[PDB]
Design a binder for this molecule. Structure first.
Ligand SMILES: Nc1ccc2n[nH]c(Br)c2c1
Length: 111
């Protein structure tokens, strides 16, 4: 069984974000070839995406919830590093990130 907090990351945070209309670009690792993203892996050192986060939760990978939160922070920040303020993907990430913050502020205590 996962920690209370990791269950919350899976059943509240990921479940909510996955269903959001803007989440789909984040469902799998950025494929820099398919997306024609020059030098993506030269500038983004630690790729992350919500499909990987969801798999890590399903597959019992994390030891504690802060590791999962760090993966979300990496995912969002990578989007901002690579893209300029007016890009649609930045607006999409910003909406998801606000929800992420609102939800992790309500993370439960372990008991
Ligand atoms: N980190 C990044 C940067 C640019 C992107 N375009 N589309 C997706 Br999904 C992206 C993710």
């Amino acid at each position: 069984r996962k920690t209370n907090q990791l269950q919350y990351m899976q059943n509240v945070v990921v479940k909510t974000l996955w269903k959001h209309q803007f989440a789909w670009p984040f469902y799998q690792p950025v494929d820099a070839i398919k997306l024609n993203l020059p030098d993506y892996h030269k500038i983004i050192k630690n790729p992350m995406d919500m499909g990987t986060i969801k798999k890590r939760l399903e597959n019992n990978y994390y030891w504690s919830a802060s590791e999962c939160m760090q993966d979300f922070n990496t995912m969002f920040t990578n989007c901002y590093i690579y893209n300029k303020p007016t890009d649609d993907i930045v607006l999409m990430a910003q909406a998801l990130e606000k929800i992420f913050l609102q939800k992790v502020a309500q993370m439960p205590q372990e008991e």
